Structure formats: structure tokens, C-alpha cells
RNA sequence: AAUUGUUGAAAGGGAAGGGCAUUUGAUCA
RNA sequence: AAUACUGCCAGCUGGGACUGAGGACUGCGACGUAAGUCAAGGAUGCUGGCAAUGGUUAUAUGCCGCCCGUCUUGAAACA
RNA sequence: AAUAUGUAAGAAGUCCUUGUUACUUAAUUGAACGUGGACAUUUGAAUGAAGAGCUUUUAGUGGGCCAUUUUUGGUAAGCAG
RNA sequence: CCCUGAAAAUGGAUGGCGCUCAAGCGUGUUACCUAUACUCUACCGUCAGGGUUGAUAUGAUGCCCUGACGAGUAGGCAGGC
């Protein structure tokens, strides 16, 4: 008793009936696979000018 | 026929009119109905849009959350305004004068602002004083705090709270979620 | 109620276009051109019957 | 349909290496402008390196008969694809004007090759001016002198669908 | 059986053009790479590490990190019903700088231009792009152009 | 509370001087109709007369119907008429031709039926067959303070202002042409004219381009 | 109710039964 | 000059069929110098006949109409 | 080649000045994040959009077939793929 | 175009009757008939956009205005006997 084995036939019906939809972009993205060295810079440089402008503007 | 780009006949998926049966309830839903549509301030259009939500979309707001809120530059002389329960936070010392209307006011909040020196009011006295929502300030607690919400989609490298009944070892710690037993999540 | 159909109810169109009323009267659809006239050139003539 | 004459000029889209680009002219049989503006082009980019898209038509007008009035002999070559082939053909008509005679000669070919009006296509027609150069005798025969031919046989029509005395096909 | 490898059916993919074979030129190792970036993929086939994948051949994608020799690169790949991003590190020798971009910095910069010369009168900038609109009207001379008749040839039957 | 004659009377004012504006506007408009007319016939004579052709500039301005079902569609050509808003048969609208108009056609001509309009039948379409588009809405356009309350920040108040914007194509024309609904046009009255309407028009029949030829069949329809 | 006998009414050229509209017969505000 | 063909008329008019929805006024227009009128955000006036029309059922006529439920890509099947 | 296919066609942008870093550079030399300041008609190609985005739950589904075109096995098949 | 090539078993199929300057064959032009298709109108239901506590007067889940749509197995939801 044999069978049918693979199809494509109505799958991108399928998978358009619900619009194929692009990822949502942020402004800030994701800081992960970056350089650790430049990350641990930019946490530095980032508490250093936070408190800059604390210190600046109140 | 149309070869239809949308759904045909499909609802707008907001909560018209509320689903409970609370008599008072719907009366306060008539009274700001009528005023967000004889009026045009977006507030009454706001507090009528909550004023549909659920036990789940309404959580409560804290006294210590109304005081933070407040401590805000120019919010000092606002009335607070929150659509569902006020409770009462033990954690807080200091609760500063002021006036917050709700549906529902927890007794340990309410002996806290009328010793402090404030004033519970209701949405309808609330209406009264500010037909169109003016000097006021809506406070909306937190909805995904939750403890339902945590275990919303679960999945491979989410750690999103697995839906279990007991806690401690050897219950949904084994292989699956250490690198000594083979993968880990 | 009702959608009544320019090009056939007078006070419909005049409503529209007020200009109906002075087009009417100076009876613009039947404007005679004109008088001119002018020659084609040779090579055009010759153009036409070139076989 | 009723066929009629276009005649239409056109040339390639001028460019700044080749200004005033030359212009060709065709006349073709056709129903209406756009057949004849298709049929042009069709035409066109089967001699020239030419394109719709990489040219335009400066002119398109109908060209009537002189003499629409005057019965005249036509020649006219063609070549048409069949089931098995091309072939060119050489056709004598007898016509008052050229459409006509182009019209007869379509229905000619249609009726007695099995050929269509995507596959006749028209080389040329002329009109022969002298009754010696005809080479066809279905032609020829109809320039006899003295040409008198009765009508034997006349069919009347009826307007009912009942006659009650036996009709009598004289003439 | 089947066989779905990584360079499975890529023998003219990650193939050397034809008499370009050889070292790569130095050129390449002399661009500079910032994160934003946008920057196509092309495999060569001389250098076999940090090769990218069948899929992501001939791909544009934003350039988010830098390393030694090797930039990281988010490609928008079509999995189902739903565009997933995937973070791929790949050598400098496979990626190269997309001209679209820098046309589009160009159009920026004469945009500006024009916003600044004729907004200093005012008038009509009219600073957006327009597509190929119809021809206007035109007139031909027949001057030594006379047209020519053109009829269909016969046909022939040439070997 | 007597003042109601007094705002009565405001509003004739101020309806008869929005007439006053509309009359002269629709005076200009066709004195420059004829004006441009006349103007091409005595182009093309003058080119004639003096041994040359007169290139006719293509017309900017066409008019696509569509004379197919809404099944046995292909995904892509399905979409370019959505967004062509053609998603009932005998459904027309109005297009700028541009480049990209012009292949977007080419993709979904064997569906349509598309040519250049005339100033009447556009006028005939938008008396008969026009609508608005106001709150989602299919409102009939039975006067012209619809007209100025939809369009008045482009310079459109009036009909026959909405049927010039249509007829020149404008600064404006984007917006004058979305603002319509599609107009939803029954069968030919006289009949197609051909047998087979999935033929082309060289072919011998409805589909395709028929330049001009497409006023007989739009008033025929409409 | 299935089934059966009489009375009263209708139809019946190798089926009956139904729908679209009407004539005729019986009955009905 | 006329005529054939095409396109336009915010040119006129003859004949026939379907429809009468809405229910004191509200608006946009026209005629009328002005009263007032109108084919202008959905039909009224007059007159005639009866106090048969029409509802249910049976037969007849023109057309259409395969046996209910399940399995199946496929049912009415000689499943 | 055609068809099919990725990216860009802007305010999450551009430009001027200069604050931070434990990154880097011979070096205030580059990189990131910034503060202040300038550019809203025509916000940067056309068209469209009973609005778009996001979360929870779950019924049934996991035997298909046929039609145009490309095409494998087979001589062919209302054959299989 | 037609003819020989061209022979299968109950009695039968351009549906048949039948048709011969066809009612057969190719092409050209008009008129004519119709789908639950298209345009308008009347009614029902659904959805969307709104008005209506200035009342004696009640059902603001009530009333009214405008626009669009209405197929369907398994299955889901809602309103009702």
C-alpha cells in the first residue's frame, strides 16, 4: 500500500493566508555575538557619559 | 461576487458595553458614554474604553504606585484617576495629600488617604467636578506582572516559566536542562 | 432617499452646474469653426498615393 | 471586417547619437487603426531591427479609392504559411476598389486553403492598366466583348411560410 | 539514499570564474567595514573558511559586527509563514560594499543641495522623483527623410 | 429666539457667492477646453500644410474596465487588481499613464479592458455613475458641497472641477481619482460586438487595448 | 401509528412520490 | 459643394414594461423684478366595478428532479 | 536569455560644533553612545489599503485527485513518481 | 474537400429526426435568447461609521441615519424553540 511521499502543492496558499510577515525592527537591537571587549567599552563609556549628563544637566 | 481582500462581516474585536451584569456598573458606562459622545475631551472617551475591561486587563494600583505617579514635576495638584481597585501598601510611609477616584476603594487604602488628608471619590463625582477631564492623571497598574503571564510562550532558549504543579528537585530538572545529562533547554 | 440622474433632470443638472443655464443659452455644443483653410504640401500629397 | 486601407509612417525613438532617425512607410489592410498599428509593427520587426517599445509612429491615415466607381483587375502576390509550408501565390481579382478585392481575396484563400488571417500574408497588390497581361482564366473570361449571360434558375423568396400556387423559377 | 550537505549542489556556485583563478586581488582586505552597513554576499572558492551557505549566496544584508578578519551579517530568511533574522560572521573576502546604497547617499546629498539653492528663493523644489512620463507632442521633417515603402518579401527557401 | 430668518439669509449669501465663484471657474474651464481643442486641430493642419506629420503627444489619462470573473485568477494578477481596485466585473477606474502604470497594465491586460477616454464620456461617467468615498462610505455626489467638504484642501469644490482634475491630470489628480469609488458599470447595452470577448482586440475581441475605441463601449456600458 | 373493511372525493398507455406557475373541483375571512 | 464613416450636443420629441419605498417643516436648486409657484433630499388627483381578489388541498398542463445515512479523491450504484 | 529572487528609494534621516570610554590609534587619530544646534508645502518613485501591531486558548486536518506548462521511470496506460 | 488504405462480435448513435448552391466545411458583418453573472429598486440578516437623557416617555442590550457584504464539508462561536 503505497503513498503519496512529498508535495508543495498549497503550501504558499497556506502560508499567505496569514501574510508572511517581515521581523519587527527597534531601534536599539540586540547586543549579542558583538566583540565582548567592544561591549564591556561601550557599558563603560555609556555609565561615564550618563554621569556626565547628570552631573551637567538636572 | 468581490474576490474580497479582508474578512467579510468580521467583528472589530473591542469590548462594547461591558460584560458584567453590575447594575451600577453599566449606569456608570451610560453616564460616561453620554459624556464622551456630547463631549470632546479624549479623557471621557479613555476612562468609558477602560471602563469595558476585565478582572485580568484591570489590575490594581498601589497607593505607594498613586504617590510615585504623583511625585512627577507639575502632578503635585492632579487628580488621580483610576479605572478598577485602589489597594492599600504597607511598604510606604509617607502618602502625600491629594485626590484619587475609583470604582472600587480597598478599605486599608481608603483609611490611608483620609489620614493623610485626602478624599476617596467616585467615577460620577469625578465626572461632576471635571465634566471634561481636566487636571487629572490616569493610573493603570501592571498587567504582565501576573503570575499566568509568566508561563506565555514557552519554548526551546525562552525560559518562560514551564507550567508545573510542584516545586524542588528531580521535578522538571533533569536531562533537558543541564549540559551533564545531555542538551540543556 | 433617492438618486436622481443628471443628463435627464433639468433642476438635478442646473443644480450641479449653473454654467448648464448660459451653455444652453449660447447654444455652445453646435459652435461652428472657423473658416480656414489650408493645402497640404506636395510630398505629403504624393506620400498618400505612393505605390 | 471591412477592410480598409492605413497607411502609416514611423521611425525609431530619436537618440543623440543618431538625431532625425529615417522613416519607413506601409500601407496595410486593416479594420480599424489599431489592427493597422499592430499589423505595422508586426511587419516592421520582421525586416528592421525595430521594437514598439525603441520606436513610435509619426502618421497614420486611411487612404481612399481614386476611382471607387471603376471596375479594374488586381494582382496580387502573397505568401501564406499552410499545415506543411510557405508558399507564395500570384491571384488575379476583379474589383472596384482595393479593399474589396483584398476582402474577395481573403475569403478566397480561407474558403479553398484552409488559411487564415494570421497566416496570409499581403506582398503586394497592383492594379494591372492593360487587359493583355492577365494570366488567370476565371479573369480573363470576364473581358470578353459583348458579355451577355442570362440567370437561369431564379430562386424568389417568400415572406410566409405558405404559397398556394406552384412557383415557377423563370427569368 | 539523499544527500543534503553544506555545499551540496554547488559545484557552479562555489566555482572561480573563468581565467580569474588564482590569489584573490588586494583590494578587498583594504575596505573598510562599519556596523549599518549594507553589503552583498558572494562566495569565492579559493578561501574555504567562513564560507557562507548555499542560501545566503547573493543575499544584502546590514553589517552589525567587526572582528579581526570577519563581519557579522542579519539576512531575513523565509522559513514557513514568517521572515526569521539570522546573524551569520563571514570573512571579508565573501562579502562586497552594494553600490544601491551609495547612489542613495549621492541622491541624499544632491537633495540637500536643492533644498538649500532653491529654497533660497523658494519656488518649486520639487524635490521627489517621477517616473518615465509620456512623450510630448513633437514635429518631424521630411527634409532629405522622405519615407520610404516598405512591403513584406516573398519567401525563400535558402540553405 | 427670532434669528433664525437672520441665519437663513447668511446662508443664501454666502451660498450665492459660492455659485458666483463656481460659475466663473466652470466658464474658464471650458473656454480653455475649446481654447486647447482648436488649438490641436490647427496644430495638426499647419503640420500637414507645410510638408511634415504632427507626432500626437500619448494620452496621460486611461480608463480600465474588467471583463473577467473573479475565479481562474493568478496570485500576481489577482493582487495588481486589487490594487488596481478592480474586484467586480464591469468595475472601471481611472489611471495616469506613467511607466509603471503602464507594465502594472501589461500584467493584467488579458482581465481588462482598458483605452484613452474623451471629456464626454468622463463627464457621462461622473453625472451617472459617481461616488465618493466619505467615512468608508459609498455617499452619492448629488451636489457640490460634498465635493469642497471632501476636497477643498486641493483646490477642488465643485463636479465639474472633480471632472477637470480627471480629464488634465494635475498636481491633485492622485487624490481626486482615490477619493471616487470605482464605477460599478452593467453590460454593453448593444452587446460586445464580437463573439469571443477573451480575444484580443486585433484578435477579434474585448480584451486588450482599444485606444479610443473604448468610449463607444464605456457609454454602451454606462 | 404501522395494518385492514365500508361509505364519500380524485387519478391511473411499462411505477408512485417532489419543486418552479396557473386552470378546474372542494373548502376557507 | 454635397455625401459615406466616426465622435459631440448642458438639442427636441413619439411608444412600451417594472417600481410607489419614505410620512407635519428643516437641505441643495429653478421659474417668478415681486407675491407665490415648481418635474427641486422616494406619487398624487379623478373615475369605474364588486362588497369577486386571495389562502389550503386534489387533479391536469410546460420544464426540472436518481435512494436516505456512512466510508471514500471519486456514491445513486452491480459497495 | 525569459520567468523567478534579495536589498535601498529617508525624521530610527542628513549636516555643523564637541562630552564620555577600561576599545583602538605614534597621537583628540578612528569606532560606539551622546548634548546642543539647522533642514514640516513637494517627509524624499507609482498604486492600493471595511486600519495596523501584539498575546492566550482550542475544534478538525496529517490517505487526495484533476486541468495548462516544464519534466522522471515506462513502448503505452483513466500507470507510478 | 473527397476516395482506397479503414475489419469484431445484443440493435443505435454529430442526441436524434434529418440535411446536399446544406441544417457539412473556413472566413467576413448585423439582428435575436439566456446564469443564482452585471446595474437599479423593495425586504431580511450581519458588519462598520454615527445621531439620539432638554422631558411627562418606558425597553440607551431601546429608536433612528448612512455605507458595504451575504456560497460552503469537517469544525468553532453566537441568537433562539
Known amino acids: 500500500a503505497k503513498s503519496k511521499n512529498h508535495t508543495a502543492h498549497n503550501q504558499t496558499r497556506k502560508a499567505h493566508r496569514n501574510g508572511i510577515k517581515k521581523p519587527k525592527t527597534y531601534k536599539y537591537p540586540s547586543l549579542k555575538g558583538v566583540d565582548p571587549k567592544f561591549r564591556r567599552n561601550h557599558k563603560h563609556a555609556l555609565h561615564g557619559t550618563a554621569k556626565a549628563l547628570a552631573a551637567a544637566k538636572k | 461576487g468581490i474576490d474580497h481582500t479582508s474578512k467579510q462581516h468580521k467583528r472589530s474585536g473591542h469590548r462594547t458595553a461591558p460584560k458584567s451584569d453590575n447594575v451600577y456598573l453599566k449606569l456608570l458606562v451610560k453616564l460616561y458614554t453620554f459624556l464622551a459622545r456630547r463631549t470632546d475631551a479624549p479623557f471621557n472617551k479613555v476612562v468609558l474604553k477602560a471602563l469595558f475591561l476585565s478582572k485580568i486587563n484591570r489590575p490594581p494600583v498601589s497607593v505607594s504606585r498613586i504617590a510615585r505617579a504623583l511625585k512627577q514635576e507639575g502632578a503635585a495638584n492632579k487628580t488621580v484617576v483610576v479605572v478598577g481597585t485602589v489597594t ?45 477631564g481636566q487636571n487629572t492623571l490616569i493610573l493603570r497598574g501592571p498587567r504582565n506582572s501576573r503570575e499566568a503571564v509568566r508561563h506565555f510562550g514557552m519554548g526551546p532558549h525562552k525560559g518562560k516559566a514551564p507550567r508545573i504543579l510542584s516545586t524542588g528537585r528531580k521535578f522538571e530538572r533533569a536531562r533537558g536542562r543541564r549540559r551533564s545529562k545531555g542538551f540543556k533547554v | ?45 504624393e506620400t498618400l498615393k505612393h505605390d | 471586417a471591412h477592410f480598409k486601407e492605413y497607411q502609416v509612417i514611423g521611425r525609431r525613438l530619436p537618440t543623440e547619437s543618431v538625431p532625425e532617425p529615417k522613416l519607413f512607410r506601409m500601407r496595410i489592410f486593416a479594420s480599424n487603426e489599431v489592427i493597422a498599428k499592430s499589423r505595422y509593427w508586426y511587419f516592421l520587426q520582421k525586416l528592421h531591427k525595430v521594437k514598439k517599445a525603441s520606436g513610435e509612429i509619426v502618421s497614420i491615415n486611411q487612404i481612399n479609392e481614386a476611382h471607387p466607381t471603376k471596375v479594374k483587375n488586381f ?44 497566416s496570409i500574408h499581403i506582398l503586394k497588390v497592383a492594379e494591372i492598366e492593360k487587359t493583355a497581361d492577365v494570366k488567370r ?22 415572406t410566409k411560410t405558405f404559397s398556394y400556387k406552384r412557383p415557377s423559377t423563370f427569368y | 539514499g539523499k544527500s543534503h550537505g553544506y555545499r551540496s549542489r554547488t559545484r557552479y556556485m ?37 564560507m557562507p551557505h548555499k542560501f545566503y549566496q547573493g543575499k544584502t544584508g546590514v553589517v552589525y559586527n567587526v572582528t579581526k578578519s570577519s563581519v557579522g551579517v542579519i539576512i531575513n530568511k523565509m522559513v514557513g509563514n514568517r521572515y526569521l533574522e539570522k546573524r551569520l560572521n563571514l570573512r571579508v573576502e565573501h562579502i562586497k560594499h552594494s553600490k544601491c546604497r551609495q547612489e542613495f547617499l549621492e541622491r541624499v546629498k544632491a537633495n540637500a543641495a536643492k533644498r538649500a539653492e532653491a529654497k533660497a528663493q523658494g519656488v518649486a523644489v520639487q524635490l521627489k522623483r517621477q517616473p518615465a512620463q509620456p512623450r510630448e507632442s513633437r514635429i518631424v521633417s521630411t527634409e532629405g527623410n522622405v519615407p520610404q515603402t516598405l512591403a513584406p518579401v516573398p519567401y525563400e527557401t535558402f540553405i | 429666539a427670532e ?28 473656454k480653455e477646453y475649446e481654447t486647447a481643442e482648436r488649438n490641436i486641430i490647427q496644430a495638426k493642419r ?97 451636489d457640490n458641497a460634498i465635493i469642497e467638504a471632501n476636497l477643498g484642501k486641493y483646490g477642488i469644490l465643485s463636479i465639474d472641477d472633480l471632472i477637470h482634475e480627471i480629464i488634465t491630470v494635475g498636481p491633485h489628480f492622485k487624490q481626486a481619482n482615490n477619493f471616487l469609488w470605482p464605477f460599478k458599470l452593467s453590460n454593453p447595452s448593444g452587446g460586445w460586438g ?26 454602451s456600458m454606462n
Open chain 5, 14 to 50: 562555489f566555482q572561480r570564474d573563468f581565467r580569474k583563478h588564482g590569489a584573490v586581488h588586494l583590494s578587498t582586505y583594504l575596505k573598510v567595514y562599519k556596523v549599518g552597513d549594507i553589503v552583498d554576499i558572494k562566495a569565492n572558492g579559493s578561501i574555504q573558511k567562513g
Open chain 6, 3 to 30: 434669528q433664525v430668518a437672520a441665519e437663513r439669509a447668511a446662508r443664501k449669501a454666502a451660498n450665492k457667492e459660492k455659485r458666483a465663484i463656481i460659475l466663473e471657474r466652470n466658464a474658464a474651464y471650458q
Open chain 2, 88 to 132: 492599600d501598601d504597607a511598604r510606604i510611609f509617607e502618602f502625600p495629600k491629594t485626590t484619587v477616584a475609583a470604582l472600587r476603594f480597598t478599605a486599608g487604602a481608603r483609611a490611608k488617604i483620609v489620614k493623610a488628608g485626602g478624599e476617596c471619590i467616585t467615577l460620577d463625582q469625578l465626572a461632576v467636578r471635571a465634566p471634561k
Open chain 6, 194 to 219: 464580437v463573439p469571443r470577448k477573451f480575444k484580443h482586440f486585433i484578435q477579434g475581441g474585448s480584451f486588450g487595448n482599444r485606444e479610443e475605441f473604448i468610449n463607444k463601449l464605456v457609454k
Open chain 4, 137 to 158: 482564366q476565371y479573369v480573363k473570361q470576364f473581358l470578353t466583348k459583348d458579355l451577355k449571360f442570362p440567370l437561369p434558375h431564379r430562386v424568389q423568396k417568400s
Open chain 6, 46 to 142: 499647419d503640420a500637414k500644410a507645410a510638408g511634415s506629420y504632427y507626432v500626437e503627444a500619448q494620452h496621460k489619462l486611461v480608463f480600465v474596465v474588467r471583463i473577467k470573473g473573479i475565479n481562474k485568477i493568478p496570485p500576481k494578477p489577482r493582487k495588481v487588481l486589487q490594487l488596481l481596485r478592480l474586484t467586480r466585473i464591469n468595475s472601471g477606474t481611472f489611471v495616469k499613464v506613467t511607466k509603471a502604470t503602464l507594465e502594472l497594465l501589461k500584467l493584467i491586460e488579458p482581465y481588462v479592458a482598458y483605452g484613452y477616454p474623451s471629456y464626454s464620456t468622463i463627464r457621462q461617467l461622473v453625472y451617472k455613475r459617481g461616488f465618493g468615498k466619505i467615512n468608508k462610505q459609498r455617499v452619492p455626489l448629488s
Open chain 3, 1 to 45: 432617499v433617492l438618486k436622481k440622474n443628471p443628463l435627464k433632470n433639468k433642476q438635478v443638472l442646473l443644480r450641479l452646474n449653473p454654467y448648464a443655464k448660459v451653455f444652453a443659452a449660447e447654444k455652445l455644443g453646435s459652435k461652428k469653426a472657423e473658416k480656414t483653410g489650408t493645402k497640404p504640401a506636395a510630398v505629403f500629397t
Open chain 4, 75 to 118: 494582382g496580387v502576390w502573397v505568401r501564406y504559411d499552410s499545415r506543411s509550408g510557405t508558399h507564395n501565390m500570384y491571384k488575379e481579382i476583379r474589383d472596384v476598389s482595393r479593399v474589396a478585392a483584398v476582402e474577395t481575396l481573403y475569403q478566397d484563400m480561407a474558403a479553398r486553403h484552409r488559411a487564415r488571417f494570421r
